[PDB]
């Protein structure tokens, strides 16, 4: 029994060594839609991370051998998810490993924002010693607002209440009991906008969330509010955040994800003074890398059986 | 009843207005040791932050008018307590208001270093999109060793376990009950060195602690340890820290204090790739500033009664 698993995108040797113990593993890496279509007819399972677009044509082209698609990581946006099961192909993901290291990165964005770790380190490496330019805020007692109470959203909260913040969340799909059991009040969407000193974005990018943080949302906010985006860019109106920081509605902004990766080489948020930008690093911790590998590994393998 | 308080160094206008309700206040900022010896004979109280030297000659020069010296901030290194006590003079300080925004900043240095927030932000801004160079490390389950279990020491432990780390400390003058009461084991010095995935330094600088972090220290540590200093520079042999980063014993280092502030323009720690540096920003939060003003103000006024 030699099941065949095509691994389209780089994968953590920890997991590749689990798959190789339970399957044939093809690691052709980055194939053109046609190469892939040619291979998938001969694969009992496909594993992808983010770049591979498991479209409708990919299921169509397999001819019913492809049983299970393994999405390494958290999101699944790229698997045509309705074709998948229409053709009778299970789709499984690797959420919990990247989830930890992704809230970990949000918190790291929040604290480093709040004290200007980033600008200051640049200022001092550049010889300048400008102690008065980089005075930060505290976190204790500050109200943090979480939009979209996912695993990361609630894992974040848990870390932010450990830093001693008041943490609130808005997400119409959120178990009032789970929230109250970590100490998070579920609040209205206007209450979250107004009363927050800090706002993080953990929302999926749907038509209802697109360009959500636009000029109307920034008006409702408290002045002196700071904002951290670790979910998906473009859920912010990028031009509108450029204008709210230029005014002093938003005091400073911490941005992992963008509307475009790589962002424009002139793109104003990335270049702005009060912004702390990292290049979609949210799940870039060695530990998650190796634990996501092992997760879809065990996930694919358990489907396949 | 008109008391006279000489405030040598800037002070949050909150504090100044409290002091001007209960005394005459001279804000002669930055005097030469002679001008201060001249004034101190006309002053019932002297409030200083970190730069003014309350040496022995000052206590002599005042002739006994001076009743209380107020240390705006945490330590008292600059005040010759020995001489003040001798000349029947009280010393008071502003420990708690800074204490927190110190630990706060310490944590921010930790999380920003773990995830290369500083190096990555400066790269993106520099056009570079280098997603793989800047893979971070998970904090969770890691061992944070706190050398010096002061008020700031324990206060960091609190934030750390809330990020979900395994926090041990070594300070021989620490109540094992306070320690266990916040979930921190107190451990030997060789244990702190060897077991730690992270080491922060909250140690004041004695001839015992001077250049304590030395080549012999670094060999004892676990390879890939990351070191966060927010207490006093010099406790670290800079030359040896650099040689331990360049050799990869020390993974990376987040340094707020230095052996010489402002550091040398060529200083290899400041300019090093794996080092995140801030210019002694430890207490530079707007909250801890206004809060320390009002602390010594109350502290001086109460003594002065």
Author numbering:
A (entry chain B), B (entry chain A): 83 to 387
Quote what the paper states about this structure.
Exome sequencing was conducted to uncover variants, which were then filtered against the third-generation Zea mays haplotype map. Among the candidate mutations listed in Supplementary Data Set 1, a C-to-T mutation was identified in the second exon of Zm00001d002051, resulting in a substitution of the 282nd amino acid, from serine (Ser) to leucine (Leu), in dek20. The overall structure of DEK20S282L was quite similar to DEK20WT (R.M.S.D. 0.465 Å). According to the structures, the residue Ser or Leu at 282 was located in NBD but had no direct interaction with NAD + . This change enabled His284 to interact with NAD+ through hydrogen bonds, which may increase the binding affinity and affect the release of NAD+ from DEK20(S282L), and eventually decrease the catalytic activity. The dissociation constant (Kd) of DEK20 was found to be 32.45 μM, while for DEK20(S282L), it is 8.11 μM. These results indicate that the S282L mutation significantly enhances DEK20's binding ability to NAD+. To determine whether this enhancement resulted from the interaction of His284 with NAD+, we mutated His284 to Ala (H284A) and observed that the H284A mutation reversed the increase of NAD+ affinity of DEK20(S282L). Notably, the wild-type DEK20 exhibited superior enzyme activity compared to its mutated variant, DEK20(S282L). Correspondingly, the decreased enzyme activity of DEK20(S282L) was also restored by the H284A mutation.
DEK20 and its mammalian homologs are classified as type I PGDH, characterized by 3 major domains: the substrate binding domain, nucleotide-binding domain, and regulatory domains.
